[model samples]
Target: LGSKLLVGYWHNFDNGTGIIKLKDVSPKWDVINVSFGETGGDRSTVEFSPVYGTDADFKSDISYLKSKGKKVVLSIGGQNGVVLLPDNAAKDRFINSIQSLIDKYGFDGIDIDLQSGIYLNGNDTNFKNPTTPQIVNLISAIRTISDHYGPDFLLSMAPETAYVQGGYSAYGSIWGAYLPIIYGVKDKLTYIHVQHFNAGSGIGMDGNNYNQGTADYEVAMADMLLHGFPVGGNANNIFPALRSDQVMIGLPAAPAAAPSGGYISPTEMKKALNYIIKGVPFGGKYKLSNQSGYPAFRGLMSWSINWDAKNNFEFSNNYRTYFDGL
Candidate 1:
């Protein structure tokens, strides 16, 4: 919401079968993380499988998005990133297939959102786990190919927010286990989209699991940016990749039962941006970690743009006013 734009999308795993055409709608979103992989447990049918859309269909979507100057990223791993049905070879194969898609569709890059099956933002952890390392290796491999492709190809992550490591945490760990890797891959990463909705001490509520609070939003961004990670060729900066998708917190209509606060309105969205941009300080049980940049305080990046019209854009006046300021 700072200088950063509001980008949104939905996870339509069923090969985009009933998926709404997004590119034709809002072309302002920089990148949309399309859920192209599996969703574990009883929700396995979310993926496209081998049926539904052809490679051409996916490619066409991406191609059209690019034509409109929007970036389309294929999101892999979810609750299913840990499931072992497709096996290790599947990871490599998926990588290869994605590479093919990148080449064929001229897409920007890929986003790895490996949640429950492995590292859950370092919340759900067990030291004797092989799946964890496998997930790491998978990311390593993805980075390898992403690098091979060149600088234009982004390798961002949708990790759990607020952990010290600052990678995506769907599940696992006391702190982000992938922090070091995330730091190491900073240049390769275009952005580190974190899940800001969870349990936390600063979030104004605590539980056996999950942390909550908009303050964690500041904490997570500060933790990542405090260091020069995702540095834009400068040893004194953390580039400009920190963002919070669902700025309102929790559901679109409900207030969070957790702590701190929940669901700031679209009007409040402007206030959040103003606070971030103008450096207005708010004192709470948990204060914003005192960030260092305004242009760096970009927010509202959903995993995809599927929900923009319905959820965020429903209040177009707010949206219009926000962009007008920018």
Candidate 2:
């Protein structure tokens, strides 16, 4: 039963309404990302609603998931909050907030989902240079937290496509800050789930431009991450590659989930999965420069469990089959 993960984010406790119950979520999901522990007063002050049910119910469900070998991690930051450390005090606050959450909820790990806000654009001035200390501090602090949590603790990051798959030197935007952060902590990192949606256009592994939502886009982006590629830099042309098992393809669960872009049908998604993991082409437009397939690529992740649940668990159910077969 050693299967690749099908990580689904859960948004049941936002705005104080239990949209979905933790216990009632589909069992097919291997990992549940409790979404958006927003930053409150400070970079370290995290506001998370880890309770959709009674306190008893929350604890009981967490134990239940662990008993079934399912992982549950707190996803920090989203499109709204400011989750960056500008100084030592901010970094300490960040660590304190995360540790408090872990102590309270016993999260199996933490997922860094810092989106726009101070986390991404606060230091936009120095984004062009790789000597960003805040970025380095953030990565080091997270790695320290993970090590303190012990070896069994999971560590994952959910950066948008631009931060990860974009060329380094040409990535003059603030979102690119997380790329070098990931590079520094690649050892302690468990999974790098790059959100493929909301990305308008990107350069593929074959060095061709592809629009989001196409099979070519998904395969090309993932291929580059799996087998290294050249980045735009002084001497850092080739960005280091990651092991197949450390990378995951993240996408929106359905058309409406990410209304902007990056939504492949389940049928086509399966074809892309087979193409990457099984080395079979699915009539995809772009081909990887490195044709050696990644038979052990980790798995897929979606925006939220609520979306998948509303859609009859289409994302989890569909991808779970392929992951299990692997």
**What are the RMSDs of all candidates, in order?**
7.6, 2.9
Per-residue lDDT tens digits for candidate 1, residues 13-104, read 43232355544556555566666555445322224332335777767777787777777766766544543323455556555656765676
Which residue segments of model 1 deviate by more than 4 Å?
1-3, 13-18, 39-54, 80-91, 119-132, 162-174, 198-262, 282-292, 315-320
Report backbone clashes per prediction. Answer: 31, 0
- Top candidate, metric lDDT: 2
lDDT, residue 162, model 2: 72
Best by TM-score: 2
All candidates: TM-score: 0.66, 0.91
Positional deviation of residue 277's Cα in model 2 after best superposition, in angstroms: 0.9
Model 2: clashing residue pairs?
none
